[PDB]
Amino acid sequence: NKGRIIQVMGPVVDIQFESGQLPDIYNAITIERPQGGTLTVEAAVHLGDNVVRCVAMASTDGLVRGLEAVDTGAPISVPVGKATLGRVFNVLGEPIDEQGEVNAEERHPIHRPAPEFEELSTADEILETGIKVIDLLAPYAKGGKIGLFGGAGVGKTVLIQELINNVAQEHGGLSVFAGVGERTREGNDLYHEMKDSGVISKTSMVFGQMNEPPGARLRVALTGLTMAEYFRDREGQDVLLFIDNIFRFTQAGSEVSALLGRMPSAVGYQPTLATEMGQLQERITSTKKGSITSIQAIYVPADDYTDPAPATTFAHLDATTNLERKLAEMGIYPAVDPLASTSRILSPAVVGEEHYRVARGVQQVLQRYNDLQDIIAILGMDELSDEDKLIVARARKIQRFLSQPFHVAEQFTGMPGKYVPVKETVRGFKEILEGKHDNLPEEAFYMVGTIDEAVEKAKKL
Amino acid sequence: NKGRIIQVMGPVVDIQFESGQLPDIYNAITIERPQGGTLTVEAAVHLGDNVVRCVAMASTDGLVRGLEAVDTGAPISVPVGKATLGRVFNVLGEPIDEQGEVNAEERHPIHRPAPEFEELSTADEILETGIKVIDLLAPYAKGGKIGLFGGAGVGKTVLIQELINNVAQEHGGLSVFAGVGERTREGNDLYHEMKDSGVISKTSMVFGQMNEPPGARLRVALTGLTMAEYFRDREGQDVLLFIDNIFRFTQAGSEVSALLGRMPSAVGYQPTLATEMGQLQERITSTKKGSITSIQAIYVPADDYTDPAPATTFAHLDATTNLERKLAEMGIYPAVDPLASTSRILSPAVVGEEHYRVARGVQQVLQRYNDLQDIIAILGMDELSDEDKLIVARARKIQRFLSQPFHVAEQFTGMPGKYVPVKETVRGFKEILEGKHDNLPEEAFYMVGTIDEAVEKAKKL
Amino acid sequence: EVGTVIQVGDGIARVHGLEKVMAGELLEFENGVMGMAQNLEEDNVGVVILGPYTEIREGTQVKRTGRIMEVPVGEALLGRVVNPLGQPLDGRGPIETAEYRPIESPAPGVMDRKSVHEPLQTGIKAIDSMIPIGRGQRELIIGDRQTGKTTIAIDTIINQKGQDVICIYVAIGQKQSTVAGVVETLRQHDALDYTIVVTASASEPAPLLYLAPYAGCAMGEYFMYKGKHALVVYDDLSKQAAAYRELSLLLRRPPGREAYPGDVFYLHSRLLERAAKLSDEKGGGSLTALPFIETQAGDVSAYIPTNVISITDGQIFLESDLFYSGVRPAVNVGISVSRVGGAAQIKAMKKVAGTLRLDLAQYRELQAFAQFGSDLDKATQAKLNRGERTVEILKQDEHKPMPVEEQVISIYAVTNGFMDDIPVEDVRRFEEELLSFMRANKDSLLDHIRQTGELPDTKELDAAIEEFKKGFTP
Amino acid sequence: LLDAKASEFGARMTAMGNATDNATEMLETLTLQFNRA
């Protein structure tokens, strides 16, 4: 139960307990004294001689050797359920928004095994988002991990919010946002971004952020995850869970490992990169009660995606959404690259032959559009097959019918929002492909919902 | 004499003996019990306190601390002489071919110093192989190491066998094949390859192969080498000795080193890379009783030949033979690149002015052939000197007169074989160069022995 | 018999007092979790915890098992989803067997083997015709994430519904959900009756990922050494290598060449050297292995990739480009090979394919002249146009293995120009419907290939085709 | 008919040089995207 601090070396604290009274690993041990608060460290290694080495979750300045420590008897446990919605927390499950304490009924440990083999759903299902381009071309699967590649100016957070909104909206799924290792300003910005887009009410936020020690950065996601795991397991819904910079997470992994004096890999990373990633990722899954679909922002400054850190994360991805600056400065405002984005559940097996064929249909057209693009570049529009010239017009319409007004954007544009069922997206693009709307003006597909809405607007200009 | 096992950590076993009863290093210590066989470990380091650390030659699963061990009083010793011919062994000199035990008269240690300075032959001599291209262009020297670069589909083993055959044939030299660290299927394949080419009768084979522990892979060549050393030293002949993937050997070096907790170099290799290589290579030499010429297959997957491993091996090479896929799919079936292949003993000093001049003759022609090749590429056969055009025909004939039917290939093609004395190879190509056979059809030099045989066939088609 | 933990960390433990444990002995912790005696340090054992490491702390007791690392083995496992220790994950009971095998054991010697000669039909047209796989072969399947490697193992496994061969899907570091999906797909194709699933997902302990292939291989070895035929697929030897590397300098082994240990090659070579084709003397059993390497950015020149390449007997490369062009399987027949070759390929296929290798080899070059059909009559729509046709019969839906016979007719059809008068958006259906036509009518020809299959009665073949031919619906 | 021929290919290599060139150029545009995200 109680121990006394033997060593303090950075975020690493060595604590001697009494024989046979030693903490399971991952156990929150609280340390108090000597100037004010309460430091929480997490059991990491039993060094022997009843010493156990830990990682701090906050600064260990001022700690003094001998200070009493108390094994809480459980991993860092955090509030769950209704109580966490609209509230922002840190790793410890403490409210960092000065808004009261969380009147949560329960508090779950952030460390736990992934759902067992027989609890796993055995068939892929599309997580229907509002958005036409991701649903048609790069579908999210329930219990899926999606890599979101963006640059903020490409409206990554507007995407996040529409997602949160539309999943809350047309399913009943709440969301968790886990800010890991990024800019605290960016976190604050997003908070307000969605506090007056109203979306915050459907979300609990957890913040690590690059000012925090590595132990906090490393565990922060596990908190968000735990919170999302409630709404799946209790409440049985299809929860979201966004991790902003999951890459920062594996990099927090590296810092802590170094602090614990491990290997490390010849590229700097932990010996346990993959293991730790898997331990997080594997809990994000579609159980039989069904649920969690993680949208993970992956930045990595270096831009080498062959790097072990991105490599590992990618192993888990099931779809990638690619926010494109080019499309943004072009008007297409879910600025998702139709060609770059992909989903492993774009099988006819998952979305049916029709959807699949329409999508492979839209893809080839847009691809062809690029080929011809280079053709007229080097051969002029001279010698352009009437058909080729034709399937260029359908590309321009498709490219436009891939944009759509967001509910979250209402408060600026105000279109208002549009949620488009895949059933209707597929139909929509199927007609465009079949040539059922060549006659319509190309700016008539820009920012509409269903194809029905596009004829409505072919009656202007 | 007797010891007991103190530590077992992988292929590394630490054994305590009695004071002053400690094994010379490289000494085979046998360990028996507890489920069946007999494990042999090789003394590596005297750690002190009468403990000596060893490297295993087989798995050390099941070993228990305390088990008795027995210093054999000598390095791993292996059968030699007539008894080993046609038999396949492992590192321990045990028959792995289920064919009886070896009724060998003696068993020599595989560890030993290289022949001493005064036993060394002091003049280079060409080891006359059957083959025209290697004898004219990239001669083997007795006590030479040759790098053989091939890809199996380029008929590397057919080359090995013709070599074994032709040296057995026209000298009296036997051969040893040492399979180091390669595919066991490939070994079995070669075994049968030459069990029904009949060549196996002139060969003893030793197999390491990539399923074996590093201790075995590292020593295996030393066994082969020891065997070949018999026929040189006893019996006084010009023995062969093939090591397949000598690179695997230095890499076994690295594993064992790591297991012993050494340096290592900043590129991963042993501190003792070069030493170990020299310790092997230096025994392969032309003594005054004369002999051993090693043909070493060097693969290295990475394809960087600046890598320390290949670099070191190359330090020893005296000729390289380059098996070329291009020449193979072209018909030239000792598919040896005439230009790429080289020998340090292609001096006029070693093969005489004539041979030298004929070879430097053939070389320039074949080089010129390539220049003109690029000329007609970019200037057409338009503007092609009647002489230039002329020395292109002589190149095509030369290129062809460099192929030759193998005895070993008889059983498929059946030409039958051809052995061509350098005396006659030199003469052959000298006449081609002098223009003494321009008038002959160019397919008349394909697959003949002597130039005499090529006029015979200029009487067809 | 009984030892006790004195330091634990990162799943590695120094246990004391297991005096007579053997190197690599299975051990059981107080709480039922297993471990293995990794090192016998002078005055303590280094035990590697093989499961939940969390409730194992200092002072925890460890028991001897008396057994070297071993796994349940035998037909008792067919259809069960298991982890490398052989404990069931599908909740379908215990595994009722009494026969075990060491996860580490010797590979068949150079004398225990005979050359691969019996075909392992994957059912995949692209692979069974070019890149043909024999029994006892190690054929590498290498490609980026999401290029459909697993789908290829599944089709191949499914295609063994024929049933000379028992299949072991070993999933290393895959997402549990993906494996659960794989198991379900196997179920729906009635292919799980003859399939063992060994699994160590992404969240499992590294040593568990490390052992996975050696378990699945041991399971395959029981059958090979029995005289039967097994096919083992190691889904991600990449993930194993990384798993192994973690375990290494947790044990603080010196880092070696590249990010990995020195023995990372040995790790893999030791393993799929155990897949073999046994001499008749040794029973003629076989174990065939489909290792997966997962490349990043199609970097095939990387360390682990090049290693395994120099270990196996050929590789099937999966182009990422192709897969996002919807081309499936996304096989790159160009650079892809079977070193075993047509030795494991029935006479019929070995024939009709022979030409086909050349066919789209030529179509590779002239490919460049894509949407510019101008060269008229030369090496023109003779080569090019009929090359486009071949590439269509190579395409093939997921989980639709095609019986050799059907593959062979289908290939022969196009390769003998029976598609040339037919369109190109029309090749795929003309094939699907050509076969359905034979299965119900010209079965004589089909069964003729199922019995010493060389196809013959050609011209009768060409006639039989033409009696479906003439298009009548292009 | 004879003059009409020269002219066509006369016109054809001219569009082909221009064609080649235009590819090079355009390629050298595209290549910036090959590396900088």
mmCIF file with all atom_site columns, N, CA and C in Angstrom, chain C residues 56-89:
data_model
loop_
_atom_site.group_PDB
_atom_site.id
_atom_site.type_symbol
_atom_site.label_atom_id
_atom_site.label_alt_id
_atom_site.label_comp_id
_atom_site.label_asym_id
_atom_site.label_entity_id
_atom_site.label_seq_id
_atom_site.pdbx_PDB_ins_code
_atom_site.Cartn_x
_atom_site.Cartn_y
_atom_site.Cartn_z
_atom_site.occupancy
_atom_site.B_iso_or_equiv
_atom_site.pdbx_formal_charge
_atom_site.auth_seq_id
_atom_site.auth_comp_id
_atom_site.auth_asym_id
_atom_site.auth_atom_id
_atom_site.pdbx_PDB_model_num
ATOM 1   N N  . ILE C 1 56 ? 1.824   -10.173 -12.613 1.00 0.00 ? 56 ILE C N  1
ATOM 2   C CA . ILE C 1 56 ? 3.083   -10.775 -12.251 1.00 0.00 ? 56 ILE C CA 1
ATOM 3   C C  . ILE C 1 56 ? 4.006   -9.693  -11.719 1.00 0.00 ? 56 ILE C C  1
ATOM 4   N N  . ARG C 1 57 ? 4.252   -9.728  -10.411 1.00 0.00 ? 57 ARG C N  1
ATOM 5   C CA . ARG C 1 57 ? 5.150   -8.774  -9.772  1.00 0.00 ? 57 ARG C CA 1
ATOM 6   C C  . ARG C 1 57 ? 6.216   -9.514  -8.972  1.00 0.00 ? 57 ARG C C  1
ATOM 7   N N  . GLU C 1 58 ? 7.089   -8.781  -8.299  1.00 0.00 ? 58 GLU C N  1
ATOM 8   C CA . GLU C 1 58 ? 8.156   -9.420  -7.542  1.00 0.00 ? 58 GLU C CA 1
ATOM 9   C C  . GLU C 1 58 ? 7.556   -10.285 -6.460  1.00 0.00 ? 58 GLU C C  1
ATOM 10  N N  . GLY C 1 59 ? 8.214   -11.390 -6.158  1.00 0.00 ? 59 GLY C N  1
ATOM 11  C CA . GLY C 1 59 ? 7.725   -12.291 -5.137  1.00 0.00 ? 59 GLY C CA 1
ATOM 12  C C  . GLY C 1 59 ? 6.767   -13.329 -5.690  1.00 0.00 ? 59 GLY C C  1
ATOM 13  N N  . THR C 1 60 ? 6.341   -13.131 -6.931  1.00 0.00 ? 60 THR C N  1
ATOM 14  C CA . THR C 1 60 ? 5.462   -14.091 -7.594  1.00 0.00 ? 60 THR C CA 1
ATOM 15  C C  . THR C 1 60 ? 6.158   -15.433 -7.838  1.00 0.00 ? 60 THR C C  1
ATOM 16  N N  . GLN C 1 61 ? 5.464   -16.521 -7.519  1.00 0.00 ? 61 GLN C N  1
ATOM 17  C CA . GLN C 1 61 ? 6.028   -17.853 -7.669  1.00 0.00 ? 61 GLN C CA 1
ATOM 18  C C  . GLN C 1 61 ? 5.912   -18.397 -9.103  1.00 0.00 ? 61 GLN C C  1
ATOM 19  N N  . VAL C 1 62 ? 6.927   -19.137 -9.531  1.00 0.00 ? 62 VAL C N  1
ATOM 20  C CA . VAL C 1 62 ? 6.918   -19.733 -10.850 1.00 0.00 ? 62 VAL C CA 1
ATOM 21  C C  . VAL C 1 62 ? 7.115   -21.215 -10.660 1.00 0.00 ? 62 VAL C C  1
ATOM 22  N N  . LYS C 1 63 ? 6.421   -21.995 -11.470 1.00 0.00 ? 63 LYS C N  1
ATOM 23  C CA . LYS C 1 63 ? 6.487   -23.437 -11.379 1.00 0.00 ? 63 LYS C CA 1
ATOM 24  C C  . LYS C 1 63 ? 7.162   -24.004 -12.621 1.00 0.00 ? 63 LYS C C  1
ATOM 25  N N  . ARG C 1 64 ? 7.860   -25.126 -12.468 1.00 0.00 ? 64 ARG C N  1
ATOM 26  C CA . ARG C 1 64 ? 8.400   -25.827 -13.618 1.00 0.00 ? 64 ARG C CA 1
ATOM 27  C C  . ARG C 1 64 ? 7.306   -26.631 -14.278 1.00 0.00 ? 64 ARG C C  1
ATOM 28  N N  . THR C 1 65 ? 7.429   -26.820 -15.587 1.00 0.00 ? 65 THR C N  1
ATOM 29  C CA . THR C 1 65 ? 6.472   -27.574 -16.374 1.00 0.00 ? 65 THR C CA 1
ATOM 30  C C  . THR C 1 65 ? 7.099   -28.896 -16.754 1.00 0.00 ? 65 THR C C  1
ATOM 31  N N  . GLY C 1 66 ? 8.418   -28.903 -16.857 1.00 0.00 ? 66 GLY C N  1
ATOM 32  C CA . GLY C 1 66 ? 9.148   -30.095 -17.219 1.00 0.00 ? 66 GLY C CA 1
ATOM 33  C C  . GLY C 1 66 ? 9.159   -30.309 -18.710 1.00 0.00 ? 66 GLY C C  1
ATOM 34  N N  . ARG C 1 67 ? 8.535   -29.402 -19.445 1.00 0.00 ? 67 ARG C N  1
ATOM 35  C CA . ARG C 1 67 ? 8.455   -29.505 -20.894 1.00 0.00 ? 67 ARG C CA 1
ATOM 36  C C  . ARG C 1 67 ? 9.155   -28.333 -21.586 1.00 0.00 ? 67 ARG C C  1
ATOM 37  N N  . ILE C 1 68 ? 9.967   -28.620 -22.600 1.00 0.00 ? 68 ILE C N  1
ATOM 38  C CA . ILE C 1 68 ? 10.539  -27.574 -23.452 1.00 0.00 ? 68 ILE C CA 1
ATOM 39  C C  . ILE C 1 68 ? 9.418   -26.955 -24.259 1.00 0.00 ? 68 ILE C C  1
ATOM 40  N N  . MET C 1 69 ? 9.603   -25.718 -24.705 1.00 0.00 ? 69 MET C N  1
ATOM 41  C CA . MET C 1 69 ? 8.554   -25.015 -25.437 1.00 0.00 ? 69 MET C CA 1
ATOM 42  C C  . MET C 1 69 ? 7.895   -25.919 -26.452 1.00 0.00 ? 69 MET C C  1
ATOM 43  N N  . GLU C 1 70 ? 6.586   -26.093 -26.306 1.00 0.00 ? 70 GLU C N  1
ATOM 44  C CA . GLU C 1 70 ? 5.828   -27.025 -27.120 1.00 0.00 ? 70 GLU C CA 1
ATOM 45  C C  . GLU C 1 70 ? 4.394   -26.545 -27.196 1.00 0.00 ? 70 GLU C C  1
ATOM 46  N N  . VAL C 1 71 ? 3.680   -27.033 -28.218 1.00 0.00 ? 71 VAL C N  1
ATOM 47  C CA . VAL C 1 71 ? 2.283   -26.666 -28.465 1.00 0.00 ? 71 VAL C CA 1
ATOM 48  C C  . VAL C 1 71 ? 1.445   -27.895 -28.782 1.00 0.00 ? 71 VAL C C  1
ATOM 49  N N  . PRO C 1 72 ? 0.171   -27.857 -28.385 1.00 0.00 ? 72 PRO C N  1
ATOM 50  C CA . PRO C 1 72 ? -0.808  -28.834 -28.830 1.00 0.00 ? 72 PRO C CA 1
ATOM 51  C C  . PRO C 1 72 ? -0.674  -28.996 -30.338 1.00 0.00 ? 72 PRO C C  1
ATOM 52  N N  . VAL C 1 73 ? -0.845  -30.216 -30.818 1.00 0.00 ? 73 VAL C N  1
ATOM 53  C CA . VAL C 1 73 ? -0.653  -30.521 -32.228 1.00 0.00 ? 73 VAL C CA 1
ATOM 54  C C  . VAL C 1 73 ? -1.611  -31.633 -32.671 1.00 0.00 ? 73 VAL C C  1
ATOM 55  N N  . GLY C 1 74 ? -2.060  -31.590 -33.923 1.00 0.00 ? 74 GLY C N  1
ATOM 56  C CA . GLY C 1 74 ? -2.902  -32.656 -34.445 1.00 0.00 ? 74 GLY C CA 1
ATOM 57  C C  . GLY C 1 74 ? -4.240  -32.208 -34.999 1.00 0.00 ? 74 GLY C C  1
ATOM 58  N N  . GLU C 1 75 ? -4.987  -33.149 -35.562 1.00 0.00 ? 75 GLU C N  1
ATOM 59  C CA . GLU C 1 75 ? -6.258  -32.841 -36.216 1.00 0.00 ? 75 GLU C CA 1
ATOM 60  C C  . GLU C 1 75 ? -7.275  -32.252 -35.240 1.00 0.00 ? 75 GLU C C  1
ATOM 61  N N  . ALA C 1 76 ? -6.966  -32.349 -33.952 1.00 0.00 ? 76 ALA C N  1
ATOM 62  C CA . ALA C 1 76 ? -7.810  -31.801 -32.912 1.00 0.00 ? 76 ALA C CA 1
ATOM 63  C C  . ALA C 1 76 ? -7.901  -30.289 -33.017 1.00 0.00 ? 76 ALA C C  1
ATOM 64  N N  . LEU C 1 77 ? -7.009  -29.692 -33.808 1.00 0.00 ? 77 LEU C N  1
ATOM 65  C CA . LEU C 1 77 ? -6.895  -28.240 -33.894 1.00 0.00 ? 77 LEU C CA 1
ATOM 66  C C  . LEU C 1 77 ? -7.563  -27.647 -35.113 1.00 0.00 ? 77 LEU C C  1
ATOM 67  N N  . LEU C 1 78 ? -7.762  -28.467 -36.144 1.00 0.00 ? 78 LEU C N  1
ATOM 68  C CA . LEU C 1 78 ? -8.430  -28.021 -37.348 1.00 0.00 ? 78 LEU C CA 1
ATOM 69  C C  . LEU C 1 78 ? -9.715  -27.325 -36.965 1.00 0.00 ? 78 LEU C C  1
ATOM 70  N N  . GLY C 1 79 ? -9.861  -26.078 -37.380 1.00 0.00 ? 79 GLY C N  1
ATOM 71  C CA . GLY C 1 79 ? -11.089 -25.355 -37.124 1.00 0.00 ? 79 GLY C CA 1
ATOM 72  C C  . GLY C 1 79 ? -11.067 -24.504 -35.879 1.00 0.00 ? 79 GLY C C  1
ATOM 73  N N  . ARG C 1 80 ? -10.015 -24.634 -35.078 1.00 0.00 ? 80 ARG C N  1
ATOM 74  C CA . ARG C 1 80 ? -9.938  -23.851 -33.848 1.00 0.00 ? 80 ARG C CA 1
ATOM 75  C C  . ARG C 1 80 ? -8.997  -22.665 -33.960 1.00 0.00 ? 80 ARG C C  1
ATOM 76  N N  . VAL C 1 81 ? -9.384  -21.564 -33.316 1.00 0.00 ? 81 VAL C N  1
ATOM 77  C CA . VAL C 1 81 ? -8.571  -20.351 -33.308 1.00 0.00 ? 81 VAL C CA 1
ATOM 78  C C  . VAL C 1 81 ? -7.797  -20.302 -32.016 1.00 0.00 ? 81 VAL C C  1
ATOM 79  N N  . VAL C 1 82 ? -6.493  -20.151 -32.141 1.00 0.00 ? 82 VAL C N  1
ATOM 80  C CA . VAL C 1 82 ? -5.603  -20.491 -31.066 1.00 0.00 ? 82 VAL C CA 1
ATOM 81  C C  . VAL C 1 82 ? -4.472  -19.448 -30.967 1.00 0.00 ? 82 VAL C C  1
ATOM 82  N N  . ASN C 1 83 ? -3.840  -19.326 -29.814 1.00 0.00 ? 83 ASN C N  1
ATOM 83  C CA . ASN C 1 83 ? -2.640  -18.517 -29.777 1.00 0.00 ? 83 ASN C CA 1
ATOM 84  C C  . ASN C 1 83 ? -1.410  -19.424 -29.773 1.00 0.00 ? 83 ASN C C  1
ATOM 85  N N  . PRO C 1 84 ? -0.212  -18.840 -29.870 1.00 0.00 ? 84 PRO C N  1
ATOM 86  C CA . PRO C 1 84 ? 0.972   -19.682 -30.052 1.00 0.00 ? 84 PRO C CA 1
ATOM 87  C C  . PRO C 1 84 ? 1.187   -20.717 -28.964 1.00 0.00 ? 84 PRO C C  1
ATOM 88  N N  . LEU C 1 85 ? 0.637   -20.534 -27.776 1.00 0.00 ? 85 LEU C N  1
ATOM 89  C CA . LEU C 1 85 ? 0.812   -21.537 -26.738 1.00 0.00 ? 85 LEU C CA 1
ATOM 90  C C  . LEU C 1 85 ? -0.152  -22.668 -27.000 1.00 0.00 ? 85 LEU C C  1
ATOM 91  N N  . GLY C 1 86 ? -1.086  -22.414 -27.911 1.00 0.00 ? 86 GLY C N  1
ATOM 92  C CA . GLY C 1 86 ? -2.068  -23.402 -28.303 1.00 0.00 ? 86 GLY C CA 1
ATOM 93  C C  . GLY C 1 86 ? -3.336  -23.322 -27.482 1.00 0.00 ? 86 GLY C C  1
ATOM 94  N N  . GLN C 1 87 ? -3.465  -22.283 -26.668 1.00 0.00 ? 87 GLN C N  1
ATOM 95  C CA . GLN C 1 87 ? -4.703  -22.105 -25.920 1.00 0.00 ? 87 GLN C CA 1
ATOM 96  C C  . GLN C 1 87 ? -5.748  -21.423 -26.786 1.00 0.00 ? 87 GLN C C  1
ATOM 97  N N  . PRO C 1 88 ? -6.989  -21.923 -26.720 1.00 0.00 ? 88 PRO C N  1
ATOM 98  C CA . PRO C 1 88 ? -8.108  -21.575 -27.599 1.00 0.00 ? 88 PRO C CA 1
ATOM 99  C C  . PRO C 1 88 ? -8.565  -20.144 -27.380 1.00 0.00 ? 88 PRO C C  1
ATOM 100 N N  . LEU C 1 89 ? -8.944  -19.449 -28.450 1.00 0.00 ? 89 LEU C N  1
ATOM 101 C CA . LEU C 1 89 ? -9.405  -18.076 -28.346 1.00 0.00 ? 89 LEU C CA 1
ATOM 102 C C  . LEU C 1 89 ? -10.834 -17.953 -28.830 1.00 0.00 ? 89 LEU C C  1
#
